Amino acid sequence: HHHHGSMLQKAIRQQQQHYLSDEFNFVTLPLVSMDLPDNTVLCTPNISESNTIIIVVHDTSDIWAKRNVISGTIDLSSSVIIDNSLDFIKWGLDRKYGIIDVNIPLTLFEPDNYSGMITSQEVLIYLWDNYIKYFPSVAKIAFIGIGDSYSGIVHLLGHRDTRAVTKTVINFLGDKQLKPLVPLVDETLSEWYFKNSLIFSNNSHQCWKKPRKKFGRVLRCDTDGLNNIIEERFEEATDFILDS
């Protein structure tokens, strides 16, 4: 039986690309000279001329579907995309913010997602060095990282001076492993990162079973599951964003 997991990852991002184009006319941010698909990064038009930007980073979205229990096969008509960034996108558009949506493919068929995290680091560095750094009108960025993909955000904070425009970082972690920030340029960054971040994790997390300050203010949600903790704490998150 032939695996179908990679095809699915691309099918998911492509339907997302479709909705975001039809509904809010997003577009692609050519991440040329990297062997990643075009719709990896998507963004509001005239993003270059935007004041405030929300940048949402995530791994491929989950698919929920019922499953004929004994055949074990997936009910195609019940299949839906659980898009954890869509509500942040709609929230920011409704305040005329610039939106950047980054999609990082999961590393399937491997003990964990180390490699996906590395890709996340590389894409956010490309984004910052070739774009954004050359955005004239950008003032105030908020970063939202869903799942493992958040590694790319923390990496960028530590490997680029950034505090000129970065006002908030949010991480909806779930059951994933906490990402440390190890500053390279400035040690103040440790204190800044703790006072300007929210790291939302599953109630059932390994931690709390003592998180150190390099991790940046970890909070224990009352539920589990990325979708659940985002629903649970979307207001606390957006609240925290606006006060910066």
Please report how close the Cβ of residue 203 comes to a copy of itself at its closest, in angstroms.
13
The CA-based angle 170-15-86, given to 5 degrees, is 25
- Cβ-Cβ contacts under 8 Å for 184 (sequence gap 6 or more): 158, 159
Question: How distant is the alpha carbon of residue 76 from its chain centre?
Answer: 27
Please report how close the Cβ of residue 175 comes to a copy of itself at its closest, in angstroms.
10
In angstroms, rounded to a whole number, what is the distance separating the alpha carbons of residues 41 and 24?
15
Where b means 16+ CB within 10 Å and e means fewer, 182-197 reads ebeeeeebbebbbebb
Q: Using CB under 8 A, which of 46, 49, 51, 73 touches a copy of itself?
A: 73
**148 or 158: whose CB is closer to a copy of itself?**
148
How many amino acids of this chain bind a copy of itself (CB under 8 A)? 37
Count of other CB atoms within 10 angstroms of residue 91: 16
**104 or 138: whose CB is closer to a copy of itself?**
104
Strand partners, 98: 53
Report how far apart, in Å, the C-alpha atoms of 44 and of each of 30, 76, 154 are.
13, 31, 23
Please report how close the Cβ of residue 168 comes to a copy of itself at its closest, in angstroms.
27
Site string (78-117) toward a copy of itself, x via CB under 8 A: xxxxxx----------------------x-xx--------
- Side by side, the strands of the sheet bearing 27-28 are 27-28, 41-43, 98-104, 53-59, 141-146, 166-174, 197-201, 218-220
Q: Using CB under 8 A, which of 22, 72, 94, 243 touches a copy of itself?
A: 72
Segment near a copy of itself (CB under 8 A); pick from 27-35, 50-58, 71-79, 231-239: 71-79
Task: Quote the tokens at residue 172.
Answer: 């909806």
Site string (3-42) toward a copy of itself, x via CB under 8 A: xxx-xxxxxx-xx---x-----------------------
Segment near a copy of itself (CB under 8 A); pick from 73-81, 116-124, 141-149, 164-172: 73-81
Site string (177-216) toward a copy of itself, x via CB under 8 A: ----------------------------------------
Q: Which residue has the tokens 């179908």?
A: 4
Please report how close the Cβ of residue 37 comes to a copy of itself at its closest, in angstroms.
14
State the residues that interact with a copy of itself by CB under 8 A: 1-5, 7-12, 14-15, 19, 60, 62-65, 67, 70-74, 76-83, 106, 108-109, 225
